[PDB]
Amino acid sequence: LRLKFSGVLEFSKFEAFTSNGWGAVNSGAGVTAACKFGSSNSFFRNMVWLIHQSGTYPVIKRTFNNTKGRDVLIVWGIHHPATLKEHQDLYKKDSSYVAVGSETYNRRFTPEISTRPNVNGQAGRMTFYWTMVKPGESITFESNGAFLAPRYAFEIVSVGNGKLFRSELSIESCNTTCQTPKGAINTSLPFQNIHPITIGKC
Amino acid sequence: SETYNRRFTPEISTRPNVNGQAGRMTFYWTMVKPGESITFESNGAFLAPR
Numbered sequence: 001l002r003l004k005f006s007g008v009l010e011f012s013k014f015e016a017f018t019s020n021g022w023g024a025v026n027s028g029a030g031v032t033a034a035c036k037f038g039s040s041n042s043f044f045r046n047m048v049w050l051i052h053q054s055g056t057y058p059v060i061k062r063t064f065n066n067t068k069g070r071d072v073l074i075v076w077g078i079h080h081p082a083t084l085k086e087h088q089d090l091y092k093k094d095s096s097y098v099a100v101g102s103e104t105y106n107r108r109f110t111p112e113i114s115t116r117p118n119v120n121g122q123a124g125r126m127t128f129y130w131t132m133v134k135p136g137e138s139i140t141f142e143s144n145g146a147f148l149a150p151r152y153a154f155e156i157v158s159v160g161n162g163k164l165f166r167s168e169l170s171i172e173s174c175n176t177t178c179q180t181p182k183g184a185i186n187t188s189l190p191f192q193n194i195h196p197i198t199i200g201k202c
Numbered sequence: 203s204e205t206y207n208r209r210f211t212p213e214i215s216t217r218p219n220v221n222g223q224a225g226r227m228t229f230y231w232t233m234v235k236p237g238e239s240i241t242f243e244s245n246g247a248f249l250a251p252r
Contacts, residue, residue: 061216099215106226108213140216 001073001130002164009162012073012154019048019151022060026051034120046152047077047128052092061142064133064153071156072133076100076141077148082115082123087145096145100129103137111146132156163199178202203240206232212247 020027029051030043043049051057066072078098081087087094098109107129115123126148133139133153141150167181176184178200185194185202192202210230217224227249234240242251 063216099213101215101217103218103220106213106215106217108215138218140218142216 004132006163007159007161008156009158009160010154011157014068014072014155015152016064016074017062017149017151021062022048022050022149024056024058025053025060027053032122034122044077044148046075046150048149048151049079050147050149051090055092057091057093057096057145059142059144060147061140063138063140065138066133066135068155069135071135071159073130073154073156074133074139074150075128075130075153076150077126077128078109078111079146079148080111080125080127081113081146084113086124087111087113091145093145096147097143098147099142100131100139102131102133102139104134105131105139161199163197165197176200203234204238205235206240 027048027050030049031041032043032049033041035041035043050060064074076098079090081090084094087096096111098107100107100109109127109129116125117123128148131139141147165181169182172184175186177186177188178184178198180194180198180202182195185192192198210228214225217226229249232240242248
């Protein structure tokens with residue numbers, strides 16, 4: 001996806017499923033001390049973290065038809081708890097699955113429970129997955145636990161050829177003919193010893 | 203076999219019937235080299251190599 005966000009220049013501002021469209025699940029309790037919203041506690045915004053509802057986490061399932069006519073980058077995730085007790089407290093079962101499938105995709109995941117050294121104070125982990133729904137594809141998400149629900153997708157508008165620098169600088173001006181990680185360059189000379197990663201007529 | 207070692211499992215998920223089939227078929231191929239013995243074992247979701 002970095003390879004794809006290298007060489008792309010989209011206007012990705014769309015969304016699909018509702019936070020509470022999912023039935024009979026706690027649909028507003030996504031607080032985590034790892035994704036702290038500053039002083040408060042919260043979680044990733046493009047992702048909804050679902051818990052049991054009144055001690056009941058049923059088999060939930062939704063489908064998105066991509067009638068946008070363009071590639072839509074959907075992200076979701078899956079929780080790997082630290083202990084079996086956490087899985088019981090959150091999904092009110094011992095084991096669960098995440099079945100995702102479209103005209104192209106086909107993956108059943110399962111949480112894998114084990115205690116690990118704490119990172120941001122968490123002994124559990126989260127494997128995140130991304131898929132590009134092609135135009136007029138239909139993708140179905142189905143699960144009964146350990147399921148990070150997709151909420152905010154990305155419709156890719158202008159599939160271009162823009163890259164991804166690791167550069168320690170700041171935005172500057174619009175007057176340029178060629179751009180490099182450390183600076184801009186403005187000649188039609190044939191050669192440069194500046195750096196290989198360049199964007200523009202370089 | 204002497205070289206190959208894999209246990210697969212099916213992946214049941216709700217997928218739009220493509221050719222009228224909501225399920226999928228993942229196909230696999232190997233090269234049994236001269237003088238080898240390969241063993242197939244299964245209890246479902248299996249296309250026998252005819």
